[PDB]
């Protein structure tokens, strides 16, 4: 009884693994990046990274290695998901279709076993003989690699060693050999085994066990001619090869331990290393030793290169460029230049890929346009901490406003030869054409001599030979720049009226009645070149020259009013190069041909609000490319404004859109506007590179924001941000941040780097008295004030020593008209375990200064804080306290409620309160206003790790729990038994695949009443650790049932990578139990219905009984669901 719909509004961005190899082709070098559920394939070029394929899998990529078995032209790919779904993929392309086929697949989990605390390790023989996997302690799962092993059948081998740290296959061995470092009560040792496939058991290793440093972490296998393994610890790096043994203890690497590595030379002569604090090392091996041709290691030099992002995984591309893949910061492409050495750093950043993870908190705010919200996240950690502002579509920033009574057409004009700047805007009404003049910011209306004042102007723009062509309704009367006299006037021979006008640089083709006459723009003349008649009425005409020449349009496509068909015909002739009958009924509204990024298209916009995009051939004929997008519900007029060094097209309709090309395919964005009827680019002197958009009620001039569907702006802080809240009265953001300061040998603290908290315009230090060794690092917590316009840190309040700021809320209390910044802190000491005392402090940003209005000392940790109908609801330890703000500017307690659980999470919906803890102990309260004490309604205790809460409705509650799941609880107040009304039934399960940190109410799409409203009620955003934004909305029963039928039907049609069943992945997963997902609709799968071919859409629809409109229409057609899924796509 939940009926929720979860969709991904922004795909995950954090990188958790990257490999290189000849995957797509034996000649190309690929960089494969796995974000989480998404696998991205790049091709490295001279400039940088060129994307090739973007494919998402039904799991969390946990192991990803490229191997080339003997007899294969290019490398294969082995992927193991978090649910133990192993698969082997091959890249295949046929001209233009790209598909990643699944060569082998299977499930490699065991019936019983405790998962290892170190995690999944996936290693492959260098000779490609088997795949080893360590999934459970005390067991090593070996997968034989054979052409006949299509189901990936594996056999377990017993490890006598319980705790294995890292394991890797050794290079240059006749028999397969592993070399692992493992833990004992006597310390850490390195051991080796010879895996035998015929015997299905281990053997004696090549070289005996050697005691290593007690902090050894990783094992790296050094290829030939070196051989052996290098073991990197927290203080020393050693090289074990049996007879050979060398070790160093460099002093550079002792600040932080190396966490990841990558080889840069094919023979293993140099290595890359990275640590937690994010600096790049370079381990150098010297092979100067050569006795009789044999090459052996002699020296183990280490050098420091520079400082990069906090790298989760490294990768060395060709020609000295290194991909520093970060998981809590922006990914990077650094360059290992050798001879610059600007100040002691060998690395220079080339690129920087956006990464929103981890998201710790977010708030939805309408920063620019009222009604449309924006997302401000707290992304990153340590020096990677920052704020990200996310908005949808390309906004228009208005710079002028003029009242125009329904202008039926806007065209630019340049009444100044040799000026290179527009001066007047030709606004055309139903019967009149007013030429508004604006040299600067004026709104004058200076009529041109050559332009008819009272005439329905259809086109008025500059023509060749310094002439201005004005093809009005009466006749196509030309003009000139200097003399301003009619050089030519091509009146209708039959005194007819022009219906469609299309004037180009050299040609001017107009249509009167059913006959179209093409008149070339002769020098100081109007000479016809061809004439023809159409079978039906000409709905629209489009004569636009393509690339090059720009003096003669190869084709001139026209629309038929009575036939609703588009035909492309040559300009100097009448033969139809191609014919298309896309759509019907409603007549076409506007025809246009574009050249987005050396790709030619011919877009036809019907009058029903659908755009029929289709490619075209410049030489002869045109393509079909049948694809319709409902870009609004009103007739659309297409205009082309470059404004980007790219063609671009503006779709003026009820919902404006800009059609741009991302890589090679047109992408449709949104313009954050109510309604634009006509648009025209005006490069005026007073409004340079502007875009005068004329609505149905007024005319405005502005500039576009960008050409991207999602725009993310980064405001770096160089410190970890925790919580964010928006104070609209003060127009500022309150951000809690904490920086690491090291305890030096002087009794004080010195910052590691200049942060956003030590570089504020003003500063303060909390001075309240209601209350080790050198090298130790402590956290200093601050409350920042960030401007809502410039995003500069206005203030930075610093809390007391050993005080942890946990909660932050911005609200007004009682009858006080001021809005306050209220912070709940907890004084923590290493000596004790559960905090004994904490403070509730109330700030106020007024006149650019932060002052403490009142502070309250409580005996506990203030875990969470909300506003409760003008009263403050604090959560001290395991008690929920209600505070009232008096007229003395002081808080007094009013209601206490001593729970048996510690109230981490607080939510409020009217008079209801939702309380939970990390143990997924959801508990609900209800405040009696007449009696003044909290009373409990329902309970739901279930031992599990819970990550977030949210109140979807008065009786539905959402949350995230262990194994990246989502659940919905619902109370049944209609039950007549008292034992049931005090229980929260679980009516929803789902395996999201992400660790949800924060739940927020709001949406990034503008909310309008819309009469018909929306098939989905409400909208809740959530941000995860990987840096993806979700969106969950409620559904109706019938709509949910139809969507579930669609979901079950799609699984039989679409092909997944790895042949992983969809129901298996989405089934609620936990280390002790599993069950199918119920009450949740996979939004991604449903929205993937638009991406399949027409025959697949036809096979999907057989009996879906779509006619829920009191009937059935069993057939249900195929365009009925397209309307249904479009509304589901418009919500984000």
């Amino acid at each position: 009884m939940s009926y929720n719909y979860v969709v991904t509004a922004q795909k995950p961005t954090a990188v958790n693994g990257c490999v290189t190899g000849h995957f797509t082709s034996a000649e190309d070098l690929n960089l494969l990046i796995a974000k989480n559920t998404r696998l991205e394939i790049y091709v490295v070029t001279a400039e940088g990274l060129r994307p090739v394929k973007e494919v998402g899998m039904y799991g969390k990529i946990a192991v990803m290695e490229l191997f080339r078995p003997k007899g294969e032209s290019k490398d294969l790919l082995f992927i193991l998901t978090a649910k133990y779904n192993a698969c082997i993929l091959e890249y295949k392309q046929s001209g233009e279709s790209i598909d990643i086929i699944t060569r082998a697949h299977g499930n490699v989990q065991d019936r019983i076993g405790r998962p290892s605390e170190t995690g999944i390790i996936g290693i492959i023989d260098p000779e490609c003989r088997m795949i080893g996997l360590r999934l459970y302690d005390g067991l090593f799962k070996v997968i034989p690699l054979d052409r006949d092993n299509k189901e990936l059948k594996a056999f377990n081998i017993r490890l006598e060693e319980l705790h294995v740290i890292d394991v890797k296959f050794l290079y240059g061995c006749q028999a397969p050999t592993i070399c692992f470092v493992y833990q004992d009560p006597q310390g850490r040792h390195v051991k080796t085994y010879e895996v035998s496939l015929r015997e299905k058991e281990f053997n004696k290793g090549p070289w005996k066990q050697e005691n290593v440093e007690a902090e050894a972490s990783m094992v790296i296998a050094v290829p030939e001619p070196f051989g052996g393994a290098i073991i990197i610890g927290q203080e020393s790096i050693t090289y074990h090869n049996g007879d050979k043994y060398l070790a160093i203890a460099p002093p550079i690497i002792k600040q932080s331990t190396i966490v990841c590595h990558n080889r840069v030379d094919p023979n293993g002569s140099r290595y890359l290393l990275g640590d937690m604090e994010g600096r790049l090392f370079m381990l150098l091996l010297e092979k100067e030793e050569q006795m009789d041709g044999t090459v052996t290691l002699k020296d183990l030099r280490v050098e420091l290169l520079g400082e990069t992002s906090i790298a989760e995984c490294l990768t060395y591309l060709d020609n000295g460029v290194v991909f520093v893949g970060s998981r809590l910061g922006d990914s990077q492409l650094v360059k290992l230049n050798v001879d610059s050495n600007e100040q002691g750093s060998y690395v220079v950043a080339m690129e920087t890929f956006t990464n929103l993870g981890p998201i710790v908190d977010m708030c939805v705010v309408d920063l620019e346009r009222q009604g449309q919200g924006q997302l401000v996240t707290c992304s990153g950690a340590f020096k990677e901490g920052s704020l990200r502002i996310i908005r949808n579509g390309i906004g228009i920033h208005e710079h002028a406003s003029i009242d125009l009574p329904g202008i039926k057409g806007l065209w630019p004009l340049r009444s100044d030869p040799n000026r290179e700047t527009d001066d007047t805007l030709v606004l055309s009404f139903v019967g009149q054409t007013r030429v508004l003049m604006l040299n600067g910011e004026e709104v004058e209306e200076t009529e041109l001599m050559g332009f008819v004042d009272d005439q329905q102007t259809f086109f008025c723009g500059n023509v060749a030979h310094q002439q201005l062509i004005q093809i009005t309704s009466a006749s196509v009367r030309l003009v000139s720049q200097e003399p301003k006299a009619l050089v030519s006037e091509w009146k209708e021979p039959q005194a007819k009226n022009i219906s469609v006008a299309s004037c180009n640089s050299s040609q001017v083709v107009v249509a009167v009645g059913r006959a179209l006459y093409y008149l070339q723009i002769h020098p100081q003349e109007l000479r016809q070149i061809s004439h023809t008649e159409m079978e039906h009425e000409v709905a629209c005409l489009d004569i636009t020259p393509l690339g090059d020449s720009n003096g003669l349009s190869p084709l001139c496509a026209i629309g038929l009013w009575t036939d609703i068909s588009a035909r492309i015909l040559k300009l100097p002739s009448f033969e139809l190069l191609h014919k298309e009958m896309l759509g019907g009924e409603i007549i076409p509204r506007s025809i246009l041909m574009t050249t987005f990024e050396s790709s030619h298209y011919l877009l036809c916009a019907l009058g029903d609000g659908a755009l029929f995009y289709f490619g075209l051939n410049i030489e002869t004929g045109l393509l079909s490319d049948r694809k319709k997008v409902t870009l609004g519900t009103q007739p659309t007029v297409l205009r082309t404004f470059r404004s980007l060094s790219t063609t671009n097209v503006f779709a003026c309709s009820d919902r404006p859109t800009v059609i741009y090309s991302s890589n090679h395919k047109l992408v449709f964005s949104n313009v954050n506007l109510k309604e634009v009827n006509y648009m025209c680019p005006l490069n005026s002197d007073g409004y340079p590179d502007s875009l005068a958009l004329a609505n149905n009620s007024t005319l405005t001039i502005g500039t576009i924001d960008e050409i991207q569907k999602l725009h993310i702006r980064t405001v770096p802080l160089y410190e970890s941000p925790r919580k964010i809240c928006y104070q609209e009265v003060s127009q500022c953001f309150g951000v809690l941040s904490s920086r690491i300061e090291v305890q030096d040998t002087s009794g004080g603290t010195t910052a590691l780097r200049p942060s956003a908290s030590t570089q504020a315009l003003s500063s303060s230090v909390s001075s309240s008295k209601l209350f080790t060794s050198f090298g130790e690092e402590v956290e200093v917590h601050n409350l920042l004030i960030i401007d809502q316009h410039t995003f500069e840190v206005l203030h930075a309040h610093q809390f007391l020593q050993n005080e942890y700021a946990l909660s932050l809320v911005s609200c007004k209390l009682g009858k006080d008209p001021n809005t306050y910044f209220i912070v709940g802190t907890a004084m923590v000491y290493p000596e004790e375990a559960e905090p004994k005392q904490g403070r509730i402090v109330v700030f106020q940003y007024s006149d650019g200064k932060l002052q403490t209005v009142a502070e309250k000392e409580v005996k506990g940790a203030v875990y969470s804080m909300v506003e409760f109908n003008g009263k403050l609801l604090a959560s001290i330890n395991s008690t929920v306290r209600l505070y009232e703000w008096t007229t003395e500017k002081e808080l007094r307690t009013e209601c206490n409620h001593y729970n048996n659980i510690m109230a981490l999470y607080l939510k409020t919906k009217g008079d209801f309160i939702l309380v939970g803890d990390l143990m997924r102990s959801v508990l609900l309260l209800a405040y009696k206003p007449m009696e003044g004490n909290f009373e409990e309604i329902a309970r739901d205790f279930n031992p599990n790790w819970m990550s977030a809460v949210e109140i979807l409705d008065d009786d539905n509650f959402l949350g995230a729990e262990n194994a990246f799941n989502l659940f919905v609880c619902q109370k049944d107040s209609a039950a007549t038994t008292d034992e049931e009304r005090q229980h929260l039934q679980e009516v929803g399960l789902f395996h999201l695949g992400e660790f949800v940190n924060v739940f927020c109410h709001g949406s990034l799409v503008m909310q309008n009443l819309g009469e018909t409203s929306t098939p989905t009620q409400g909208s809740v955003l959530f941000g995860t650790v990987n840096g993806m934004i979700g969106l969950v909305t409620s559904l109706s029963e019938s709509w949910y049932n139809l969507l579930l039928d669609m979901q079950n039907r799609l699984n039989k049609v679409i092909k997944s990578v790895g042949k992983i069943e969809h129901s298996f992945w989405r089934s609620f997963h936990t280390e002790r139990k599993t069950e199918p997902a119920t009450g949740f609709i996979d939004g991604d799968l449903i929205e993937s219905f638009l991406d399949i071919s027409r025959p697949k859409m036809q096979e999907v629809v057989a009996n879906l009984q779509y006619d829920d409109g009191s009937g059935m229409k069993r057939e249900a057609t195929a365009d009925d669901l397209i309307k249904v899924v479009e509304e589901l796509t418009r919500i984000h």
Binding site: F382, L918, W945
Partner: protein, 381 residues
């Protein structure tokens, strides 16, 4: 404040007999299952799994029942009576038989038996048999186990930084306030990705809670390091729950908790926030000093012992206890401590039977310094 006494005789239950018929425990329910298990009446005590119960059998019907159980699955169902009497109970524990003797003496039936709990259950119905021994509906309650709280958000790269070296030595100043700081800093290193601090995640850690409870147990009295304290959190939680001097409602609430971490948190809160003990009738008693609770046994401060005639009293051993009076002589034929002599200790105000005073019998011990209480009239406040 230490006496040369071995803390193994009271646990051995030698006052029953010496040539005990030891039976090997090789039983287990299949987990989450409907079951039917007989119940012995005339017992009013909540039994926690792992706790040893000493029972005395007098009536012929119950002796026949226990003999039949011996020639059957050696498990009965100890019922957990609530505040309301007349079999108004909802929970219980399965106790396994591992010792049986006759010791006829007077010789009617006479059975010596010791039982230890193994599993919990919730009873659905209480069926009464005409024989006199009732068999009730049993649904086995599984014991929930949870993984590490950071495994969900853990980084794959820094998973090698998860196997810590062994704890250096044990119970030393600045050898624990620093090693535990290092363990907290390195284990919950990924708490920065989430929205909660490291100490909050350490509040729900099993190992930290066990260490805190061990420190408190040492605070009560000197504990021999790993003095039979199990490493597994489930077993440690059950042992601590058995050794806590709390009333019936607190014990049944602890039994209702299904996860080890929640049980440890509840036990720690109980032993950190409850200090005052009451004398039921009386307003309060000198026993309010919880800091003087000793434990003269391996099992802990409390264990179950049976008197000569059927009834079983679990006792609390404390260092000092005022507000009491002595009636009778220091008898010694049935003291639960072999090297001690027992005396009837009566209350001084409400005169309700609680406690037994003990007198000196040997040299290397505590002369006239001993007290053994009971849950007859002691409640925590």
């Amino acid at each position: 404040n230490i006496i040369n006494f071995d803390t193994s005789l009271p646990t051995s239950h030698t006052y029953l007999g010496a040539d005990m018929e030891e039976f090997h425990g090789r039983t287990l329910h299949d987990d989450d299952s409907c079951q039917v298990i007989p119940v012995l009446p005339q017992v009013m005590m909540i039994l926690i799994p792992g706790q040893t119960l000493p029972l005395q059998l007098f009536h012929p019907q119950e002796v026949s029942m226990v003999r039949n159980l011996i020639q059957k699955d050696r498990t009965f169902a100890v019922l957990a009576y609530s505040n309301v009497q007349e079999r108004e109970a909802q929970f219980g524990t399965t106790a396994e038989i591992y010792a049986y003797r006759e010791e006829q003496d007077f010789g009617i039936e006479i059975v010596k038996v010791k039982a230890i709990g193994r599993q919990r259950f919730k009873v659905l119905e209480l069926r009464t048999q005409s024989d006199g021994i009732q068999q009730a509906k049993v649904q086995i309650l599984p014991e929930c186990v949870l993984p590490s709280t950071m495994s969900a958000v853990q980084l794959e790269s820094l998973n090698k930084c998860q196997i810590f070296p062994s704890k250096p030595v044990s119970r030393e100043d600045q050898c624990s306030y620093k090693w535990w700081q290092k363990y907290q800093k390195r284990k919950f290193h990924c708490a920065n990705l989430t929205s909660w601090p490291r100490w909050l995640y350490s509040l729900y850690d099993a190992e930290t809670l066990m260490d805190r409870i061990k420190k408190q147990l040492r605070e009560w009295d000197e504990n021999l390091k790993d003095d039979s304290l199990p490493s597994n959190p489930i077993d440690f939680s059950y042992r601590v729950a058995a050794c806590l001097p709390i009333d019936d409602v607190l014990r049944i609430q602890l039994l209702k908790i299904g996860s080890a971490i929640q049980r440890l948190r509840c036990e720690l809160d109980i032993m950190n926030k409850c200090t005052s003990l009451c004398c039921k009738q009386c307003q309060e008693t000198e026993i309010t000093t919880k800091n003087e609770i000793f434990s003269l046994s391996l099992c802990g401060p409390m264990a179950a012992y049976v008197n000569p005639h059927g009834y079983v009293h679990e006792t609390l051993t404390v260092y000092k206890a005022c507000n009491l009076n002595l009636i009778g002589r220091p008898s010694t034929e049935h003291s639960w401590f072999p090297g001690y002599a027992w005396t009837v200790a009566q209350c001084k105000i409400c005169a309700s039977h609680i406690g037994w005073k003990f007198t000196a019998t040997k040299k290397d011990m505590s002369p006239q310094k001993f007290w053994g209480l009971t849950r007859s009239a002691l409640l925590p406040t």
